[PDB]
């Protein structure tokens, strides 16, 4: 814990500043520090944690795909493979760090549905990112993602309205998992359709501000369905 000497509140404040400065590696290190204070995270703090690591790992995933593509082109010197391995290793270390925060001890202390579903979604996401680069224990990684996503689905279906943005973002990502990772395009399509339709039928209950949040994610479901069908 490099951040062990900084106040929890200062870490959160600095995470917000780093976001404004587009310094996402800093943002993630600050939020890791906050998590390691051992207190549960608020809604805003969970989202800061997620945004920070999503941005960090997103940069690594984009680099890995560029390099993997080049590696494949030259296969149809060791340098492309070596550098792809370097980036791959850094990505895996980021995913392992996020999964370690969730395991020690965010998930076990999350009793409310909004926190527990949020963290289980994250666990599915970061196993999915590991699965994207995996070859050998790819099967066990895939099943770890599936299991986390499914537990999050089961809770969100019992505890959250169908328009809840966390539930919608969960279903969106689990759908992509099904399509791209588990080679289950029909499951992906069914999940996205059923999610969209049940959300549609619940929008009448929402305030204008909730409506905006939910319909934004529904559009992402529709966007994928359009590509998939």
């Amino acid at each position: 814990g490099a951040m062990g000497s900084m106040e929890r509140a200062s870490l959160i404040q600095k995470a917000k500043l780093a976001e404004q400065a587009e310094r996402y590696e800093d943002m993630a290190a600050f939020m890791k520090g906050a998590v390691e204070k051992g207190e549960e995270l608020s809604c805003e703090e969970r989202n800061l944690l997620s945004v920070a690591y999503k941005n960090v790992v997103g940069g690594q995933r984009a680099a890995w795909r560029v390099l993997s593509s080049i590696e494949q082109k030259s296969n149809e010197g060791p340098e492309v493979r070596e550098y792809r391995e370097k980036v791959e290793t850094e990505l895996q270390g980021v995913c392992d760090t996020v999964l370690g925060l969730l395991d020690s001890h965010l998930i076990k202390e999350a009793g409310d549905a909004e926190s527990r579903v949020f963290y289980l979604k994250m666990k599915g996401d970061y196993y999915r990112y590991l699965a994207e680069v995996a070859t050998g224990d790819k099967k066990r990684i895939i099943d770890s993602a599936r299991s986390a996503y499914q537990e999050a689905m089961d809770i969100s279906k019992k505890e959250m309205p169908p328009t809840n943005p966390i539930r919608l973002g969960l279903a969106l990502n689990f759908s992509v998992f099904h399509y791209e990772i588990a080679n289950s395009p029909e499951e992906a399509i069914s999940l996205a359709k059923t999610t969209f339709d049940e959300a549609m039928a619940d929008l009448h209950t929402l305030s204008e501000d909730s409506y905006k949040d939910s319909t934004l994610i529904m559009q992402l479901l529709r966007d994928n369905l359009t590509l998939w069908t």
């Binding site: 999503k54 996401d125 969960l170 992509v176 791209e180 992402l220 479901l221």
Partner: peptide, 8 residues
């Protein structure tokens, strides 16, 4: 090409 997932 990447399909839409949640967040940035």
């Amino acid at each position: 090409l990447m399909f839409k997932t949640e967040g940035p």
